[PDB]
Amino acid sequence: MEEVEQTPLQEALNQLMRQLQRKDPSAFFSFPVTDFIAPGYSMIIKHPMDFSTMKEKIKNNDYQSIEELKDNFKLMCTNAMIYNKPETIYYKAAKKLLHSGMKILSQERLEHHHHHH
């Protein structure tokens, strides 16, 4: 019992990532950072968890909880801002993405309006 209910959840999460990635800033972080794609994320930020890595995990039911998505998504945002000073749009990109991901995250799990506090 209970198994097919996991598929529907994955669909909703995939929508949030797709809509969030479609924003603009995610276009740069839409792939696993490397020694070329990143200034040294793998060297300083051990667990960056890019939008590409996280989305791939969602397809495997790795992401099916608001806490799981936020923890990983937040890690990249926090890790991206720490290893990226306000140079041009990299700093703003991470901040803007965080706000976009948070607002969209409250779309898949909407009981009515709010929750508490």
From Swiss-Prot:
Cross-link (Glycyl lysine isopeptide (Lys-Gly) (interchain with G-Cter in SUMO2)): 59, 70, 74, 85
Cell compartment(s), UniProt: Nucleus; Chromosome
Domain named Bromo: residues: 4-108
Job description of the protein: Acts both as coactivator and as corepressor. May play a role in chromatin remodeling. Activator of the Wnt signaling pathway in a DVL1-dependent manner by negatively regulating the GSK3B phosphotransferase activity. Induces dephosphorylation of GSK3B at 'Tyr-216'. Down-regulates TRIM24-mediated activation of transcriptional activation by AR. Transcriptional corepressor that down-regulates the expression of target genes. Binds to target promoters, leading to increased histone H3 acetylation at 'Lys-9' (H3K9ac). Binds to the ESR1 promoter. Recruits BRCA1 and POU2F1 to the ESR1 promoter.
Assembly information from the UniProt record: Interacts with TRIM24, PTPN13 and DVL1. Identified in a complex with SMARCA4/BRG1, SMARCC1/BAF155, SMARCE1/BAF57, DPF2/BAF45D and ARID2, subunits of the SWI/SNF-B (PBAF) chromatin remodeling complex. Interacts with IRF2 and HNRPUL1. Interacts (via N-terminus) with TP53. Interacts (via C-terminus) with EP300. Interacts with BRCA1. Interacts (via bromo domain) with histone H3 (via N-terminus) acetylated at 'Lys-14' (H3K14ac). Has low affinity for histone H3 acetylated at 'Lys-9' (H3K9ac).
Protein name per UniProt: Bromodomain-containing protein 7
Organism lineage: Eukaryota, Metazoa, Chordata, Craniata, Vertebrata
Parent-protein start and end of this portion: 129 to 236 of 651
